[PDB]
Design a protein around this ligand. Structure first.
Ligand SMILES: NC(=O)c1ccc[n+]([C@@H]2O[C@H](COP(=O)([O-])OP(=O)(O)OC[C@H]3O[C@@H](n4cnc5c(N)ncnc54)[C@H](O)[C@@H]3O)[C@@H](O)[C@H]2O)c1
Ligand SMILES: NC(=O)c1ccc[n+]([C@@H]2O[C@H](COP(=O)([O-])OP(=O)(O)OC[C@H]3O[C@@H](n4cnc5c(N)ncnc54)[C@H](O)[C@@H]3O)[C@@H](O)[C@H]2O)c1
Ligand SMILES: NC(=O)c1ccc[n+]([C@@H]2O[C@H](COP(=O)([O-])OP(=O)(O)OC[C@H]3O[C@@H](n4cnc5c(N)ncnc54)[C@H](O)[C@@H]3O)[C@@H](O)[C@H]2O)c1
Ligand SMILES: NC(=O)c1ccc[n+]([C@@H]2O[C@H](COP(=O)([O-])OP(=O)(O)OC[C@H]3O[C@@H](n4cnc5c(N)ncnc54)[C@H](O)[C@@H]3O)[C@@H](O)[C@H]2O)c1
Ligand SMILES: NC(=O)c1ccc[n+]([C@@H]2O[C@H](COP(=O)([O-])OP(=O)(O)OC[C@H]3O[C@@H](n4cnc5c(N)ncnc54)[C@H](O)[C@@H]3O)[C@@H](O)[C@H]2O)c1
Ligand SMILES: NC(=O)c1ccc[n+]([C@@H]2O[C@H](COP(=O)([O-])OP(=O)(O)OC[C@H]3O[C@@H](n4cnc5c(N)ncnc54)[C@H](O)[C@@H]3O)[C@@H](O)[C@H]2O)c1
Ligand SMILES: O=c1ccn([C@@H]2O[C@H](COP(=O)(O)OP(=O)(O)O)[C@@H](O)[C@H]2O)c(=O)[nH]1
Ligand SMILES: O=c1ccn([C@@H]2O[C@H](COP(=O)(O)OP(=O)(O)O)[C@@H](O)[C@H]2O)c(=O)[nH]1
Lengths: 263, 181, 164, 272, 261, 271
């Protein structure tokens, strides 16, 4: 069992990763500045002997002894984002260099500051021999996700839950636990080249509208880049195993829980 | 300290926090992550005991070092005054604090007047300190499920009755417990 | 290895002598705000003594075994000394595993029991009374209280000190 | 007349830019860490009342009162990727912060290679413009040659001048049908000053659209040098600069090559 | 009347200087880390509206708004060098910043206080800092250091104790302190940039001093064996000269030593 | 073989030292802020595995792990305040470094102690006495050779310049005053000898062989092959000779020729 640091672990993906790593009995250190993260996503672990929550900004230098580093800190405010993606990543690479820790960069499918984040990691690998991992994350959904990210899956759930009409090409979405398995898979693998972590199983916009409507139980009216993971299938033995129905239900539950709290 | 219980209701009426015991949801309808232990520079007009003690002392020292710059914590206020010329239940409250009233509500389910009193003492010239049955609470919560100095120097008094105050608090407690499921 | 903050003072300097007579590596930290360097100058030069011009509100990084924190003197500087200065010695204590004795009177106490409960700092709190009690006996009491096992407060009603 | 700061001003382009701004009577300050720049490139201005040379790294914060900022600070690649990346990102952020703090206009010297860190460098300038209202300018610079240029930059024009001067055979990869577009530095320098004082905050290509085949450069340089050397075996679109700035390369190739050949020859003789 | 900073103003020369400037109704400020100075030397003034004491090391940057800076701050060799170099750099830095006239208290052993001189003239030449350099000669009087080891202290100590005056024919000249202070203020408020000798041009041999002090102490003590100050420049520019006879001087100094012991 | 730090190693003396120590197979680190030094004087070693160049100012604290420290970082003569700070704060720092990492420090002082070089020596002995730092002090006399500052107002530099440029060789007085000059490789050998010796007291490193001003003028005139017109207007190394067994071995004509070559190459570059 290892000492793991998770930047942005108080967010959507980070908190779910935090759950799994705590379950495996690791010393998880979460660093978050709560810009888009919430203390609530990890508050169940506050007090636990192997967990620690630090209100810290990755733009500011951080000095801790850890074994692994999941760098997931990246949020409207373009300057703060650019500084986080660059100065923040440089710092985590500096920290991994100083304490001899492995760093996984949570990059994005949008690379087809995140682009230069990949490069910075490879700059430290090529030059300072820092063990790096680069995951190219595609569209991900689930509990604790940002409800108003304007994305097509979130809108349909919201509109369905409030009885509003569902206002309406293919979309690929993966459940968050799939991604979390993928990150952990990649982290402990020996693949240092970039790896696509997304769900290649696509569905049309209308198909999601019709599926979510049924799963919610609403009387709402309907008005008027596919991820290739053959590398992950082969190098990691990884693929999404959580069915669309099971994942959507857990997410619908979370949204439902949140909307009732705002009344 | 405005991301808290009294902090949020005081922010509300008038329209910096590390979210240690505060939450963003308490003020997010108006949208700095700063620990008051660290020196803060902005131009204005008006469980873990170590962190609590460092906050109340080093923190209050800063705000007095800020107040002085831009024009036991009680004693530090009067030290700055003399030397440097420097001048409860409700929603969003801590449920698991251990308070008698709070405990009864949790077992049964299973503040604006303070905001006025802070404002009234603030815009007044009184720097001197000013103050702002068990069964009957139990039987009332079950159904629904000395300030004389503030009366002469301020003319302020609590005007919200007891039942108006508990029901508004009960609503909040219920809302939270459903969220925990 | 013993560190005495405010050891160029009334009590600190008699405390300084007694500990230098027993041959401990005394280090006196002081800012001379109220303490006179004459009080301890007769020790300057010897191998065991060291005098450091230092204000406790500024962090102090030294390596000692015991800390006789007696630093206490303009009301604002007095409050920064009692609060921050104490937080800096408990931080020094916690950092170098030093046993700390507070010199309370008949807030800093609370910090001292905070660091014991939370960070496991060995602390000693002496509620000192009016001294001119004679100073030689107070040193006897402070030195006795440091090398004992009583964490709680002890007056120097001395029913507790006499029996413990 | 203005107070101008030039980061990387001790290098190839920056020093030529420095010459021009000094001649125009400005208070030019050069900030450089001499990682690839040379003090000789600007030593002629040292002592002059309007010039100041600072040994500074743009990765470290800098606080000086200026009106305009020419951000040319970026090492070249023949090397040290971490320092390059840190310079292009933390360096730019430092200068954008300065420009915001003192109300200064910043021209970023970007590159044609964006068609690393130069890309995210552009984005940061616009982030500051959009959010902090900082006046920014972005030049996308194409291949530039001339005096004070790095001779071993692996570039095709540098190699031909070198091999010709040493009587070595001029090596041509392939059939030499590939085309290369090169601008003299005083042209680029002219584009940069124009762009700075214009009101075009969108990226502007500064390059020489006049192309020539590899074989054409080989033979021209061969003749201009006067050697018995043997021959062995992204085009800049600048209509935006031509229209918004009234700028175009006006220095003929021959005049520019003679001057570059001179610099190389003077340097090679000093290394003997 | 001006805002005067005096570094080392709690020392021997420093403190008598603080006495005059305070008596003249100035706003004096002492910055001192107490390395070889004592609070009782200036305790007389603490609490006064125009006096302020600061326990401060000049090796650490200082930022106060003063008009004139008397830089007198100066066993432990490394700390002394740091104090005399960095310390002086800081006060010259301070003076450049708040436009103050700095007077350096240099010594006659210049014939690193030499470099402190050279720094003051580079800040004058290059940054336009008004500077005053006093080359100070051997001084004695009240509040002087009994155990410093100089020929005059040992000859009062050993006289007063009854111990033999230890003598190692060569000549020394000594001025009284109230005379060095009068000439320090006179140099500050003058227009002389170049260094000016502050001393007493009356040499006495080493053995002469030992028998002299004896007849002043009047104790049963025996004797057992084992750069002349030119002040003409200070005369004509400053109108300053030692006015205190040696005899009266040594008496006042013995009265300090005898009271202490 | 040791890890050696050379401050100011991009200067005249420093780069020639750097060459020698790199040839001897040491791990040489050059620290310089290029205020009077030039990267070209050392660039041939950049890329080599045992060489590292750091653009650093010794007035700023430096933390490196080394065995020996050659402290040559001091500008030549303009800006007095920066010279003063480098010689004092710069030295305090390099001694502070030496104390922290246990390194032997050689200070390059000057014969002018017969500015800031005097007090630089004292600081070294303060650290030796108080902090047990192993220190060495070389009192360097006038040195000439390739890579030297040409416009240092020095009598030999001026004579080569004026001769190379066909200008008249101006000689003040009758030119009967005498000057002693050493070639740089001689000075370097002395420095390495002084560094690896056990002599911690100051040691003069100079060429005791003196010549009159007019003698240098006429020799330099002849060695250049110029038609320049002539117009009109001491190092004691016996301790170095005995303790280190060192003495200058490079003849004057040989040293002057190599120096004349350097000046000549430089003036042509200034065309
Ligand atoms: N969410 C997706 O579907 C998706 C898609 C592609 C890529 N990704 C990648 O996955 C990672 C996790 O994203 P998410 O969807 O959980 O977003 P999120 O906002 O839930 O997670 C970001 C977390 O980082 C923290 N943070 C941001 N800036 C910080 C700073 N300067 N200092 C300290 N903490 C800071 C925030 O407070 C938040 O807790 C992201 O980095 C993103 O690039 C996510
Ligand atoms: N509510 C009551 O009945 C009551 C009773 C007695 C005293 N008080 C006083 O009234 C004040 C209001 O209490 P509340 O009910 O709003 O508590 P709260 O916990 O809701 O709010 C306190 C806020 O201060 C912030 N904070 C704490 N330590 C900090 C630090 N070191 N740096 C930055 N921010 C920090 C927390 O994040 C929190 O938001 C409290 O300070 C307390 O001292 C309240
Ligand atoms: N008998 C009494 O006089 C009496 C009565 C009640 C309480 N006490 C307590 O006993 C303790 C000893 O008191 P004392 O009379 O010996 O004190 P004192 O005033 O004689 O000595 C206090 C010492 O602390 C030093 N000091 C003050 N502030 C400092 C700072 N910020 N940093 C470093 N040094 C600093 C002073 O220079 C002085 O040497 C005190 O802490 C006081 O609270 C004493
Ligand atoms: N010259 C070309 O052909 C060409 C082509 C495309 C783009 N550009 C752009 O033009 C700009 C200037 O190019 P150049 O050929 O003059 O480059 P150059 O390599 O000759 O000079 C860059 C200058 O900046 C200095 N510098 C480097 N890193 C620094 C740091 N971290 N802090 C402070 N100073 C630093 C270097 O020493 C050098 O003087 C570059 O940014 C380059 O991207 C040039
Ligand atoms: N009086 C003489 O015999 C004599 C003779 C020649 C020269 N001088 C010069 O006159 C000046 C005054 O001498 P003095 O006899 O008063 O000496 P002194 O030792 O009595 O005075 C020195 C004062 O400087 C202070 N000091 C020392 N280091 C300090 C630091 N780092 N920061 C702040 N304060 C510091 C000490 O606390 C002390 O008060 C000295 O500079 C000395 O060089 C004196
Ligand atoms: N050659 C001589 O004639 C001679 C005579 C007497 C003494 N010396 C001494 O020999 C040493 C070498 O002198 P030189 O002739 O090589 O002169 P130089 O000017 O060529 O060497 C000084 C070197 O130190 C560097 N430097 C200056 N300030 C610095 C700082 N703050 N940080 C880092 N580097 C800095 C300069 O860039 C330069 O490379 C000097 O200490 C000088 O005092 C030389
Ligand atoms: O005059 C200045 C002001 C800013 N900075 C640097 O530029 C960075 C970015 O500035 P910004 O305003 O974005 O950051 P902030 O000061 O608000 O934290 C800062 O970290 C500073 O280090 C600078 O070099 N010169
Ligand atoms: O004061 C000192 C001397 O001032 P100066 O301006 O000459 O130095 P700088 O501030 O430029 O570093 C700066 O450290 O402490």
């Amino acid at each position: 069992r290892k000492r793991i640091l998770i930047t942005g672990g108080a967010g959507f993906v980070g908190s779910h990763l935090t759950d799994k790593l705590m379950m495996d009995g690791h010393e998880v250190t979460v660093v978050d500045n709560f810009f888009t993260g919430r203390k609530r996503n990890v508050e169940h672990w506050i007090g636990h002997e192997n967990f620690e929550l630090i209100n810290h900004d990755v733009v500011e230098p951080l000095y801790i002894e850890v074994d692994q580093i999941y760098h997931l800190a990246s949020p409207y405010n373009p300057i703060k984002t650019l500084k986080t993606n660059t100065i923040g990543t440089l710092n985590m690479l500096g920290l991994a260099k100083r304490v001899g820790a492995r760093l996984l960069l949570a990059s994005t499918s949008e690379v087809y500051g995140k682009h230069v984040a990949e490069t910075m990691c490879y700059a430290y690998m090529k030059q300072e021999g820092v063990e790096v991992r680069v995951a190219r994350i595609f569209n991900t959904f689930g509990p604790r996700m940002h409800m108003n990210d304007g994305r097509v899956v979130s809108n349909f759930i919201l509109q369905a839950l409030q009885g509003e009409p569902l206002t309406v090409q293919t979309r690929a979405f993966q459940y968050v636990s799939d991604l979390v398995n993928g990150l952990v898979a990649l982290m402990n693998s020996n693949v240092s080249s970039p790896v696509n972590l997304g769900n290649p199983e696509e569905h049309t916009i209308l198909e999601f509208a019709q599926l979510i409507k049924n799963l919610v139980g609403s009387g709402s009216e309907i008005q008027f880049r596919k991820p290739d993971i053959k590398k992950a299938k082969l190098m990691l033995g990884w693929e999404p195993v959580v069915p669309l129905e099971e994942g959507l239900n857990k997410a619908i539950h979370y949204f439902r829980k949140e909307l009732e709290y705002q009344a």
